[PDB]
Design a protein around this ligand. Sequence first.
Ligand code: CL
Ligand code: CL
Ligand code: CL
Lengths: 330, 330, 330
Amino acid sequence: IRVGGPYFDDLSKGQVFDWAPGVTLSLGLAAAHQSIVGNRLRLALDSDLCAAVTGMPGPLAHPGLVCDVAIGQSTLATQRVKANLFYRGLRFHRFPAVGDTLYTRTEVVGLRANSPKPGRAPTGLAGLRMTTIDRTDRLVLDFYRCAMLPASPDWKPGAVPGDDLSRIGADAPAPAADPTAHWDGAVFRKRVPGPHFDAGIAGAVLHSTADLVSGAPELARLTLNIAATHHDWRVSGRRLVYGGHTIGLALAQATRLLPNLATVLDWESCDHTAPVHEGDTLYSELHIESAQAHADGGVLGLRSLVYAVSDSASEPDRQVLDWRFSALQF
Amino acid sequence: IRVGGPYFDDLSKGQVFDWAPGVTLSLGLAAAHQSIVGNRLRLALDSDLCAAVTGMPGPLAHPGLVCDVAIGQSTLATQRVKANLFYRGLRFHRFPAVGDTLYTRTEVVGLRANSPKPGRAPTGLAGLRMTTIDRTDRLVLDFYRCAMLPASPDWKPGAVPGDDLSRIGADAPAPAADPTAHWDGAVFRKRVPGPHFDAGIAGAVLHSTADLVSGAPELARLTLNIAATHHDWRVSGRRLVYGGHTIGLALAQATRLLPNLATVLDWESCDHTAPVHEGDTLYSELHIESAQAHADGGVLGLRSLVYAVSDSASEPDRQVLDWRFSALQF
Amino acid sequence: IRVGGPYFDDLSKGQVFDWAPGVTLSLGLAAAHQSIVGNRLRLALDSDLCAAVTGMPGPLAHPGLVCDVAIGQSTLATQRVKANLFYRGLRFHRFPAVGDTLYTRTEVVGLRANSPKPGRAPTGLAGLRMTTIDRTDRLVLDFYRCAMLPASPDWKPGAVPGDDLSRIGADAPAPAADPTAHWDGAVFRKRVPGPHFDAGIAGAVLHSTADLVSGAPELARLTLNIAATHHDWRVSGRRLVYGGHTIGLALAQATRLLPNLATVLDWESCDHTAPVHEGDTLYSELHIESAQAHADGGVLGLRSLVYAVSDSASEPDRQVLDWRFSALQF
Ligand SMILES: [Cl-]
Ligand SMILES: [Cl-]
Ligand SMILES: [Cl-]
């Protein structure tokens, strides 16, 4: 594989990138991740509660950390990325503990050359499937993204890698088993102040407080993310903040709004609406789209619109991200 | 409780905020804390010495980390804070180990509406008592602060929450037991180069080297501190640095000056003299006000004046903080 | 020893600074270090692979972290430093595990007053020997640096500390034993995708992707580095980035280029060509100078030229560092 990463025309449908380092989750990584994007997930902060609830071999790896590690691992293929158009179908098949080691395979699922346009660099889109497992060979995540890559300088433009990429990561199999089935919602309800799960909150629209985007290159280094645009301002003209950082702050915002979320069960990004830069201040509008009771608590469906604060009272704030996720709540 | 935190007129004398997440202290949190404010406390850095000295179930949680976690926990009540006028009566009742989990209760002890003043936002002061315990229900900290909060937009100003707040956190009970009684000062003296404790140093006035204020929002995220002014520049016009960060650097300064301090036993802030901002460079003048011999070493009483460096040789530096603490020294 | 550190004329040939705190290596420190300079060393990231390969009592402390801690420890003597002219003869005598504690002795090996020059501050050079051991008294590192220090304000200039410093840290004893002799290269080759060691790569010249210099004061605080120029802009006029940070990014660059390096065996800096500042963007030219087969894999000799990116397409990039190291590769 080329130094600096593949160009679009270096890739093939079915090609596999599996030489990414394994990464052992530690409370070290957890703390650094928390200092950058925040962490108010009670099971990820309190080991005694985590043990009472999950009985887990160790404390709960923050789900945003697990996702960020899997996505940063996969950037071997996409060091040359100009933009990811979406992340899709992240659903946890299990929730790793601190001390578990994650290994991520990246497969090219589909390739489509972009139509030539005057003044634009030749580029194509790569549909990528990431499969993240642990040392026990159990599936953790199996998810998709759509990466725009430049073609090599002498590439002969044409149409023919021309895969249909529209439906990438759909009808994707649900997990074999409920990843929280062994979690005891009853001790959570007893030890954590309510309100606990209530299907009556569906429909609510909440407005978060703001966070600063800072430590963005640190988050990328922490999670092995080597997409050049996060590190090197000359790729896009300014460094572009990793999508997961913006998502991470939006999740922290949602958790200040809804302090009793147990975990994130699945998520995807709907629109990366505008670029985010280091030093931006973000807030979100949180829609509770659905609330479904289960035998033990229930599951909220959330949709988060994230905005960057403009530099004055006389300039409108701008939408930068639209994403959606589901969360378990006891 | 209101989204975004209570206004001054949402509070009541005797009201309790106890739904803050528990936080398990980890060497992860310790390392992140150290990268932001520094750490030269020998018992917090060296696990072998810590074990020889304290015999402790695990290594020594840096006392500034423990305080910062307890204060960040308590910011649930004070997300809307305009200023804390002081922190008072922090005295450790025990020194938690890595792996211990901290839980903090915040009680409204007193409320006083501020007198209307033309051009100023309607506000009041809240005297707050924080009680921090571990999972074993043992008292760790029991301390006070005075927070200024805005009143809600339609509040009818008056005098009557009008509690006398002047003496908040005084005649506060000393710990039941000496929190360092089981620490072996003799192995410390044998293994660490002197000078060791000497009552003759009382009266000394020392001048520190400088530190940069950086990673301020990170320290806040790390310690669950969600006071909006640390994150959102539009609350005050610029983000204001958390008081504990400034104190943390002043403590690091004192520990470079006095490398053999065993721990901080108690502390309080005397005047938050001027705001501190990210990118400020601070130094301190350290007064050793008292030095009292005990059966095993002694206790220093310290008073620290902290200054921000101006941007030229022809502009005076400005005092930003005056605080005082006591430290055990073998 | 003087508050703020010794001046050049405070030092003596044979003087010893051994009151630096011991520092226990933790996965906390490892994570913070990784967030600042990156970490792609497979044995430092993956505990399961580390155990299979080394059998080690715990996971592998990143070698750049170990070096940075030893060098930051030693800054007690050099708080007043104006420049280190080189670091020399770092060779690992063993590779510490997480949980091991490092203790560093700094000895003045040689002193040479600099010749007076009009308009320049009076200064001298100190040749320093650092010896880093663990709690088991085993040698970890035994290395050298050349620090330029100011003389005190009333110093009487002369020639006589006038030691010959040119050959400091040469003919330095190789380790008693191969520090990786018990590492199993065969399981590494089986579990990590090739290419594995190939003497045929000697001669290659590779060009890295770029990294941002950020969190520089954090790296210094993390590793107990109290050289004032890293913290206080008024010493040099701007804060100067610690040499180890630049080296750390150059090593991260080399590891993206050569993803299967097992560890760094030794290193030294050849020229600190120009200052580096926070916010610089760096890339490197990596020369594989030598490749020598051993019974288990082989050892690469690398020379790294590091450059700072200029602020436009019409300004040349500038060399900031030239260093060289050797690495084991299975
Ligand atoms: Cl373009
Ligand atoms: Cl006002
Ligand atoms: Cl000069």
